[PDB]
Design an enzyme around this catalytic site. Structure first.
Site, PDB file in Angstrom:
ATOM      1  N   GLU A   1      -4.893   9.999  -8.901  1.00  0.00           N
ATOM      2  CA  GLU A   1      -6.368  10.127  -8.960  1.00  0.00           C
ATOM      3  C   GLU A   1      -6.849  11.678  -9.484  1.00  0.00           C
ATOM      4  OE1 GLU A   1      -8.713   8.303  -8.722  1.00  0.00           O
ATOM      5  OE2 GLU A   1     -10.591   9.374  -9.262  1.00  0.00           O
TER       6      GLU A   1
ATOM      7  N   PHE B   1       1.166  -1.011  -4.409  1.00  0.00           N
ATOM      8  CA  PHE B   1       2.358  -0.762  -2.985  1.00  0.00           C
ATOM      9  C   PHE B   1       3.888  -1.598  -2.654  1.00  0.00           C
ATOM     10  CE2 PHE B   1      -1.253   2.553  -1.983  1.00  0.00           C
ATOM     11  CZ  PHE B   1      -2.347   1.385  -2.388  1.00  0.00           C
ATOM     12  N   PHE B   2       4.254  -1.101  -3.683  1.00  0.00           N
ATOM     13  CA  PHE B   2       6.192  -1.765  -3.976  1.00  0.00           C
ATOM     14  C   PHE B   2       7.065  -1.221  -2.277  1.00  0.00           C
ATOM     15  CE2 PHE B   2       5.235  -1.354  -8.396  1.00  0.00           C
ATOM     16  CZ  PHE B   2       4.565  -2.261  -8.533  1.00  0.00           C
ATOM     17  N   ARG B   3       6.896  -0.184  -1.669  1.00  0.00           N
ATOM     18  CA  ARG B   3       7.414  -0.108  -0.804  1.00  0.00           C
ATOM     19  C   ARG B   3       7.139   1.205   0.132  1.00  0.00           C
ATOM     20  NH1 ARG B   3      12.992   0.487   0.793  1.00  0.00           N
ATOM     21  NH2 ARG B   3      13.115  -0.728  -1.039  1.00  0.00           N
TER      22      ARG B   3
HETATM   23  C1  LIG Z   1     -17.918   7.233 -14.439  1.00  0.00           C
HETATM   24  C2  LIG Z   1     -19.261   7.234 -15.604  1.00  0.00           C
HETATM   25  C3  LIG Z   1     -20.008   8.821 -15.515  1.00  0.00           C
HETATM   26  C4  LIG Z   1     -19.864   6.197 -15.787  1.00  0.00           C
HETATM   27  O1  LIG Z   1     -20.526   5.888 -17.189  1.00  0.00           O
HETATM   28  P1  LIG Z   1     -21.776   5.395 -16.692  1.00  0.00           P
HETATM   29  O2  LIG Z   1     -20.930   3.821 -16.084  1.00  0.00           O
HETATM   30  O3  LIG Z   1     -22.721   4.639 -17.665  1.00  0.00           O
HETATM   31  O4  LIG Z   1     -23.553   5.014 -15.850  1.00  0.00           O
HETATM   32  P2  LIG Z   1     -24.817   6.189 -16.680  1.00  0.00           P
HETATM   33  O5  LIG Z   1     -24.243   6.785 -17.152  1.00  0.00           O
HETATM   34  O6  LIG Z   1     -25.897   5.339 -15.953  1.00  0.00           O
HETATM   35  O7  LIG Z   1     -24.496   7.363 -15.221  1.00  0.00           O
HETATM   36  C5  LIG Z   1     -24.407   6.503 -13.754  1.00  0.00           C
HETATM   37  C6  LIG Z   1     -24.022   8.417 -12.458  1.00  0.00           C
HETATM   38  O8  LIG Z   1     -23.135   9.084 -13.147  1.00  0.00           O
HETATM   39  C7  LIG Z   1     -23.228  10.141 -13.053  1.00  0.00           C
HETATM   40  N1  LIG Z   1     -22.809  10.960 -14.586  1.00  0.00           N
HETATM   41  C8  LIG Z   1     -22.758   9.804 -15.889  1.00  0.00           C
HETATM   42  N2  LIG Z   1     -23.092  11.082 -17.444  1.00  0.00           N
HETATM   43  C9  LIG Z   1     -22.468  11.507 -16.577  1.00  0.00           C
HETATM   44  C10 LIG Z   1     -21.868  12.724 -17.135  1.00  0.00           C
HETATM   45  N3  LIG Z   1     -21.632  12.805 -18.830  1.00  0.00           N
HETATM   46  N4  LIG Z   1     -21.972  14.210 -15.967  1.00  0.00           N
HETATM   47  C11 LIG Z   1     -22.431  14.384 -15.200  1.00  0.00           C
HETATM   48  N5  LIG Z   1     -21.948  13.419 -14.111  1.00  0.00           N
HETATM   49  C12 LIG Z   1     -21.993  11.359 -14.844  1.00  0.00           C
HETATM   50  C13 LIG Z   1     -24.542  10.426 -12.403  1.00  0.00           C
HETATM   51  O9  LIG Z   1     -24.946  10.913 -10.975  1.00  0.00           O
HETATM   52  C14 LIG Z   1     -25.432   9.478 -12.897  1.00  0.00           C
HETATM   53  O10 LIG Z   1     -26.646   8.723 -12.875  1.00  0.00           O
HETATM   54  P3  LIG Z   1     -27.395   9.415 -13.287  1.00  0.00           P
HETATM   55  O11 LIG Z   1     -28.045   9.197 -14.799  1.00  0.00           O
HETATM   56  O12 LIG Z   1     -28.858   9.250 -12.275  1.00  0.00           O
HETATM   57  O13 LIG Z   1     -27.447  10.923 -13.117  1.00  0.00           O
HETATM   58  C15 LIG Z   1     -20.069   6.488 -13.985  1.00  0.00           C
HETATM   59  O14 LIG Z   1     -20.208   5.215 -13.764  1.00  0.00           O
HETATM   60  C16 LIG Z   1     -19.452   7.716 -13.146  1.00  0.00           C
HETATM   61  O15 LIG Z   1     -19.688   8.541 -12.735  1.00  0.00           O
HETATM   62  N6  LIG Z   1     -19.014   7.397 -11.676  1.00  0.00           N
HETATM   63  C17 LIG Z   1     -18.374   8.081  -9.908  1.00  0.00           C
HETATM   64  C18 LIG Z   1     -16.805   8.427 -10.656  1.00  0.00           C
HETATM   65  C19 LIG Z   1     -16.548   8.998  -9.693  1.00  0.00           C
HETATM   66  O16 LIG Z   1     -17.306   9.270  -8.575  1.00  0.00           O
HETATM   67  N7  LIG Z   1     -15.629   9.283  -9.579  1.00  0.00           N
HETATM   68  C20 LIG Z   1     -14.451  10.437  -7.854  1.00  0.00           C
HETATM   69  C21 LIG Z   1     -15.019  11.945  -8.473  1.00  0.00           C
HETATM   70  S1  LIG Z   1     -14.129  12.697  -9.973  1.00  0.00           S
HETATM   71  C1  LIG Z   2       3.907  -5.675   0.511  1.00  0.00           C
HETATM   72  C2  LIG Z   2       5.616  -5.837   1.053  1.00  0.00           C
HETATM   73  C3  LIG Z   2       5.776  -5.759   2.421  1.00  0.00           C
HETATM   74  C4  LIG Z   2       5.521  -7.150   0.155  1.00  0.00           C
HETATM   75  O1  LIG Z   2       7.088  -7.771   0.043  1.00  0.00           O
HETATM   76  P1  LIG Z   2       7.815  -7.723  -1.746  1.00  0.00           P
HETATM   77  O2  LIG Z   2       7.290  -7.320  -2.734  1.00  0.00           O
HETATM   78  O3  LIG Z   2       8.484  -8.798  -1.154  1.00  0.00           O
HETATM   79  O4  LIG Z   2       9.115  -6.095  -0.804  1.00  0.00           O
HETATM   80  P2  LIG Z   2      10.778  -6.529  -0.305  1.00  0.00           P
HETATM   81  O5  LIG Z   2      10.311  -8.145   0.627  1.00  0.00           O
HETATM   82  O6  LIG Z   2      11.683  -7.235  -0.415  1.00  0.00           O
HETATM   83  O7  LIG Z   2      10.687  -5.421   0.396  1.00  0.00           O
HETATM   84  C5  LIG Z   2       9.892  -3.914   0.257  1.00  0.00           C
HETATM   85  C6  LIG Z   2      10.469  -3.058   1.655  1.00  0.00           C
HETATM   86  O8  LIG Z   2       9.142  -3.930   2.442  1.00  0.00           O
HETATM   87  C7  LIG Z   2       9.302  -3.208   3.905  1.00  0.00           C
HETATM   88  N1  LIG Z   2       8.790  -4.617   4.449  1.00  0.00           N
HETATM   89  C8  LIG Z   2       9.127  -6.104   3.615  1.00  0.00           C
HETATM   90  N2  LIG Z   2       8.885  -6.521   4.880  1.00  0.00           N
HETATM   91  C9  LIG Z   2       7.964  -6.237   5.970  1.00  0.00           C
HETATM   92  C10 LIG Z   2       8.228  -5.990   7.459  1.00  0.00           C
HETATM   93  N3  LIG Z   2       8.015  -7.726   7.718  1.00  0.00           N
HETATM   94  N4  LIG Z   2       8.049  -5.585   8.470  1.00  0.00           N
HETATM   95  C11 LIG Z   2       8.085  -4.050   7.821  1.00  0.00           C
HETATM   96  N5  LIG Z   2       8.395  -3.758   6.587  1.00  0.00           N
HETATM   97  C12 LIG Z   2       8.642  -4.543   5.413  1.00  0.00           C
HETATM   98  C13 LIG Z   2      10.770  -3.270   4.059  1.00  0.00           C
HETATM   99  O9  LIG Z   2      11.149  -1.266   4.379  1.00  0.00           O
HETATM  100  C14 LIG Z   2      11.210  -3.624   2.658  1.00  0.00           C
HETATM  101  O10 LIG Z   2      12.713  -2.809   2.896  1.00  0.00           O
HETATM  102  P3  LIG Z   2      14.313  -3.035   3.080  1.00  0.00           P
HETATM  103  O11 LIG Z   2      13.916  -3.962   4.216  1.00  0.00           O
HETATM  104  O12 LIG Z   2      14.666  -3.395   2.166  1.00  0.00           O
HETATM  105  O13 LIG Z   2      13.956  -1.628   3.842  1.00  0.00           O
HETATM  106  C15 LIG Z   2       6.534  -4.506   0.515  1.00  0.00           C
HETATM  107  O14 LIG Z   2       6.524  -3.996  -0.939  1.00  0.00           O
HETATM  108  C16 LIG Z   2       5.898  -3.205   1.444  1.00  0.00           C
HETATM  109  O15 LIG Z   2       5.658  -3.235   2.584  1.00  0.00           O
HETATM  110  N6  LIG Z   2       5.398  -2.113  -0.148  1.00  0.00           N
HETATM  111  C17 LIG Z   2       4.843  -0.744   0.869  1.00  0.00           C
HETATM  112  C18 LIG Z   2       3.130  -1.380   1.548  1.00  0.00           C
HETATM  113  C19 LIG Z   2       2.503  -0.004   2.084  1.00  0.00           C
HETATM  114  O16 LIG Z   2       3.954   0.365   1.736  1.00  0.00           O
HETATM  115  N7  LIG Z   2       1.063  -0.162   2.415  1.00  0.00           N
HETATM  116  C20 LIG Z   2       0.524   1.953   2.218  1.00  0.00           C
HETATM  117  C21 LIG Z   2       1.232   1.494   3.603  1.00  0.00           C
HETATM  118  S1  LIG Z   2       0.233   0.026   5.343  1.00  0.00           S
END
Ligand SMILES: CC(C)(COP(=O)(O)OP(=O)(O)OC[C@H]1O[C@@H](n2cnc3c(N)ncnc32)[C@H](O)[C@@H]1OP(=O)(O)O)[C@@H](O)C(=O)NCCC(=O)NCCS
Ligand SMILES: CC(C)(COP(=O)(O)OP(=O)(O)OC[C@H]1O[C@@H](n2cnc3c(N)ncnc32)[C@H](O)[C@@H]1OP(=O)(O)O)[C@@H](O)C(=O)NCCC(=O)NCCS
Ligand SMILES: CC(C)(COP(=O)(O)OP(=O)(O)OC[C@H]1O[C@@H](n2cnc3c(N)ncnc32)[C@H](O)[C@@H]1OP(=O)(O)O)[C@@H](O)C(=O)NCCC(=O)NCCS
Ligand SMILES: CC(C)(COP(=O)(O)OP(=O)(O)OC[C@H]1O[C@@H](n2cnc3c(N)ncnc32)[C@H](O)[C@@H]1OP(=O)(O)O)[C@@H](O)C(=O)NCCC(=O)NCCS
Lengths: 142, 140, 142, 140
Positions: free
Chosen positions: B62, B89-91
């Site tokens: 982000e 999330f893959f690993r």
């Molecule tokens: C992405 C975004 C700007 C899109 O605008 P939108 O969907 O068309 O919605 P709106 O323009 O009607 O405004 C919604 C709110 O967004 C914010 N916003 C919108 N445009 C803005 C701008 N140019 N500057 C500052 N804030 C703005 C305001 O807080 C607004 O509320 P308000 O009009 O009562 O002041 C809006 O949805 C947003 O700000 N989401 C939050 C983003 C966020 O929190 N990301 C994590 C932190 S960076």
């Molecule tokens: C979501 C997930 C389990 C899906 O399994 P997958 O796509 O089929 O992939 P795989 O099963 O081939 O294994 C990938 C890795 O997942 C982990 N994993 C898979 N099954 C597991 C289990 N039952 N217990 C613990 N870890 C496991 C392992 O570290 C594995 O690598 P390795 O076993 O070869 O050492 C796997 O992609 C994953 O664990 N992603 C990470 C999730 C994560 O980190 N979210 C934030 C922390 S909670």
């Protein structure tokens, strides 16, 4: 755990709450059921980015932990492990201060994947962000 | 600080206080079409289970994608914010570092899109993030 | 199949090419490797929406079939089945006419999930859309 | 035709020729905050393996979310187009119907967001789509 109020499904955990990212930023689980869970956090600088707003990653993380732990609560005891597989967060409105309150609603509980819709609101109750969380469910290697 | 783009004289939150500075993210390279950053894995970056929190990857991408956009558009009177963040999330990562690389794929007038890759110390692809950045005229 | 040039991994298929959605809209696979595959389609009304542009769903579908079939090509013979699990397509620039050319690049090949990045370009070579495709891989029930 | 919102006198593609009309999508309800549509499963909707093509769900949601937005903004001089479509597949469909329901979650000035649910004849949740619609001033 019970510091952040995470589900106590185990005797011990590799990392203590206050030391994790969650503890660090102050996430706290409120309600927690098989189909629904809640959590919140008080906004402080630690949760923001340099521009003064709640960091995008903050919302992703809250949603992440919530959906994941919510799944853990059910399957751990079933010998499975659950990890986030996909996290898709969309930002609607920024938050500058107060809290962020998240609500995860379970939408699908498959054998290998659970899916939760997370809503993140501000103190006024406005919808500031949403996250689609996909959780992989698997058997613990250990 | 975290080596973020220096585009303004004052920032509302000092790096060390921000989420970024708290977990330790640092920008390495920065160009208009590509940027990199990294962080050392510490417990502040992990979840209770000992793995890098999924949210950490999310946060890294982000900031990186957003900041790389700011680097260009700020000077143009625009503001940039994340609008969508899709991380897959893959690993898992237990320790070491997390390195991200953001590759710009589209630069529209209102939206910039970046493909971010997050690798572990072995260079393995651990996660990906598709970052969508809203670009809008700065508010007075 | 070989009508749309889909991978011939089986003797027979439940639905013939010309009758599927793919055949109907005219998708054709060009190159196909374990890590990379290509396909294209000529734009006709069948591919557009009422406003004259290539339908958003058109890009999603092309990406869908491509990533999925690309996975099938490798695992079918391994006794697995592959189905799209998640399809995230983002639209950058619209297409009014010509073709849409897709290129899928494999980025992750796990045991349960493969991931492909699909690029969809116009005749000028511009990037009009991208799709992140997540494919579930599992053993055939049959 | 497919019962799409009648907002203009002329459309560049007749319903029956469009992708929508070709696979058979039809809009049932339409309000500013919620809309529904459906289609009969036929082979034109399937992939070679006999299941409803993932792209079909994608297309259904796309049109529904976009068209529900158009229904409101068109008359206001704006245009609406899909900008992001994220569909997740939970359970396959072999035959019958696919029914979608779009629930508006955010209506911003430049972006509208809709949660779409796709169910089978038993009412089961087969897929979901998060539709992000760009809203912009119509071009002359
Ligand atoms: C992405 C975004 C700007 C899109 O605008 P939108 O969907 O068309 O919605 P709106 O323009 O009607 O405004 C919604 C709110 O967004 C914010 N916003 C919108 N445009 C803005 C701008 N140019 N500057 C500052 N804030 C703005 C305001 O807080 C607004 O509320 P308000 O009009 O009562 O002041 C809006 O949805 C947003 O700000 N989401 C939050 C983003 C966020 O929190 N990301 C994590 C932190 S960076
Ligand atoms: C979501 C997930 C389990 C899906 O399994 P997958 O796509 O089929 O992939 P795989 O099963 O081939 O294994 C990938 C890795 O997942 C982990 N994993 C898979 N099954 C597991 C289990 N039952 N217990 C613990 N870890 C496991 C392992 O570290 C594995 O690598 P390795 O076993 O070869 O050492 C796997 O992609 C994953 O664990 N992603 C990470 C999730 C994560 O980190 N979210 C934030 C922390 S909670
Ligand atoms: C969503 C979107 C409008 C966002 O605009 P953006 O990211 O800021 O990009 P830009 O404004 O710089 O313009 C990119 C192209 O989008 C189209 N576009 C942008 N704004 C437009 C508007 N108000 N009216 C018509 N087309 C527009 C144009 O084709 C434009 O190219 P051009 O400026 O050379 O004519 C744009 O990315 C887009 O149109 N993506 C395609 C949408 C799509 O095809 N969905 C499926 C069919 S509905
Ligand atoms: C992706 C997927 C396999 C993940 O499995 P899951 O989340 O763990 O869910 P489940 O395993 O509990 O099973 C859900 C349904 O998937 C289908 N499925 C699962 N594994 C299957 C397999 N090996 N072979 C065939 N169908 C299978 C079944 O119809 C199943 O329902 P049922 O077995 O109770 O009758 C599953 O969600 C799915 O098939 N989604 C549909 C994918 C799709 O339709 N894409 C477009 C068509 S290719």
């Amino acid at each position: 755990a019970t510091g952040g109020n995470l589900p106590d499904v185990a005797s011990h955990y590799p990392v203590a709450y206050e030391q994790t990212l969650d503890g660090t930023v102050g996430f706290v689980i409120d309600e927690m059921t098989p189909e629904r869970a809640t959590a919140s956090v008080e906004v402080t600088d630690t949760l923001r980015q340099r521009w003064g707003l709640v960091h995008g990653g903050a919302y992703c993380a809250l949603a992440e932990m919530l959906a994941t732990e919510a799944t853990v609560a059910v399957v751990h005891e079933k010998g499975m492990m659950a990890v986030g597989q996909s996290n898709h967060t969309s930002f609607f409105r920024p938050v500058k201060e107060g809290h962020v309150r998240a609500e995860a609603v379970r939408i699908h509980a498959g054998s290998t994947t659970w899916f939760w819709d997370v809503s993140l609101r501000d103190d006024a109750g406005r919808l500031c962000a949403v996250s689609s969380m996909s959780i992989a469910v698997r058997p613990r290697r250990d």
